[PDB]
Amino acid sequence: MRKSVIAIIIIVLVVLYMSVFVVKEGERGITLRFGKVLRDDDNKPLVYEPGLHFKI
Amino acid sequence: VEMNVQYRVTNPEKYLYSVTSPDDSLRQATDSALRGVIGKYTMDRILTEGRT
Numbered sequence: 098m099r100k101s102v103i104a105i106i107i108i109v110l111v112v113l114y115m116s117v118f119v120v121k122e123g124e125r126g127i128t129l130r131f132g133k134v135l136r137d138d139d140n141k142p143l144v145y146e147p148g149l150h151f152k153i
Numbered sequence: 154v155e156m157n158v159q160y161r162v163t164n165p166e167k168y169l170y171s172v173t174s175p176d177d178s179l180r181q182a183t184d185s186a187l188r189g190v191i192g193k194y195t196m197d198r199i200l201t202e203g204r205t
Binding site: 121122123124 | 166169170171
């Protein structure tokens with residue numbers, strides 16, 4: 098029960114680093130899907146403030 | 154006409170994330186101000202009186 102537990106622990110760390118993305122103070126990032134952008138509130142593209150956000 | 158502008162900076166949140174190349178951008182504004190200002194007065198005035 099050592100190889101199984103250690104293997105899952107190591108892979109999650111690399112996945113999380115890629116997923117996390119923060120927005121600088123003087124910049125704004127708009128998360129994008131394969132070709133489209135993320136919408137909300139009756140198809141209003143969302144722009145991110147300078148905080149942490151998660152992307153698959 | 155030649156001018157010298159002594160200045161300082163403030164909290165880097167503005168200076169760093171307000172305009173690209175803040176030193177260069179300010180220089181362009183200075184040229185417009187100097188020319189615009191000079192543009193109002195005549196040559197004789199600018200040479201002796203306009204100095205101040």
